[PDB]
Design a protein around this ligand. Structure first.
Ligand SMILES: Nc1nc2c(ncn2[C@@H]2O[C@H](COP(=O)(O)OP(=O)(O)NP(=O)(O)O)[C@@H](O)[C@H]2O)c(=O)[nH]1
Ligand SMILES: [Ca+2]
Ligand SMILES: [Mg+2]
Ligand code: NA
Length: 166
């Protein structure tokens, strides 16, 4: 049974955990909880293949860290998450994608750019801006809401599909 090793990265507070817990357990964590387990497992059927997701939910990262690079370098694909109402988090994406490229030693890494919190009205990152950023990386852009479930499955399943192309 194939296992897909996914890693969730991005700035603090963008909804990495909320996305992963919505995916795995169908619950929205509406309260920012600072001790949430990093590892998740789920058996799912994706395009007719019964498979295991092994998801590593990481933290935001402000400063370079060799142990953080090591913790995430065995991912097969990466969800690079920002929030649509957090310009900073969007601008921070390129540090995360550089870290991915450094750890995989490649510019051809399975990856999905996720614009989370799409339910919220205070949008400061336009869809076009993110589409463009994603296009510059050669990856898809998908908007999600961990609160409403919009795009959540899509983002994770898209990442599996990208891993399958690699
Ligand atoms: N409205 C809304 N709020 C959300 C969404 N996703 C996350 N949140 C909220 O944003 C806050 C942070 O979410 P959380 O998942 O803890 O962020 P994180 O990226 O895992 N933070 P960290 O890197 O510090 O571990 C929580 O209050 C959460 O409820 C969303 O799609 N919509
Ligand atoms: Ca603007
Ligand atoms: Mg978290
Ligand atoms: Na790339």
């Amino acid at each position: 049974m194939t296992e897909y090793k996914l890693v969730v990265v991005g700035a603090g507070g963008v909804g990495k955990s909320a996305l992963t817990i919505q995916l795995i357990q169908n619950h929205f964590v509406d309260e920012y909880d600072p001790t949430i387990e990093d590892s998740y497992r789920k058996q799912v059927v994706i395009d007719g293949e019964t498979c295991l997701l092994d998801i590593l939910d990481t933290a935001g990262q402000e400063e370079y860290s060799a142990m953080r690079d090591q913790y995430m370098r065995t991912g097969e694909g990466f969800l690079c998450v920002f929030a649509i109402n957090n310009t900073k988090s969007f601008e921070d994406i390129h540090q995360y994608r550089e870290q991915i490229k450094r750890v995989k030693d490649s510019d051809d890494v399975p990856m999905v750019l996720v614009g989370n919190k799409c339910d919220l009205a205070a949008r400061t990152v336009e869809s076009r801006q993110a589409q463009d950023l994603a296009r510059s990386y050669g990856i898809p852009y998908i908007e999600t809401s961990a609160k409403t479930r919009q795009g959540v499955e899509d983002a994770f399943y898209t990442l599996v599909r990208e891993i399958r192309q690699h």
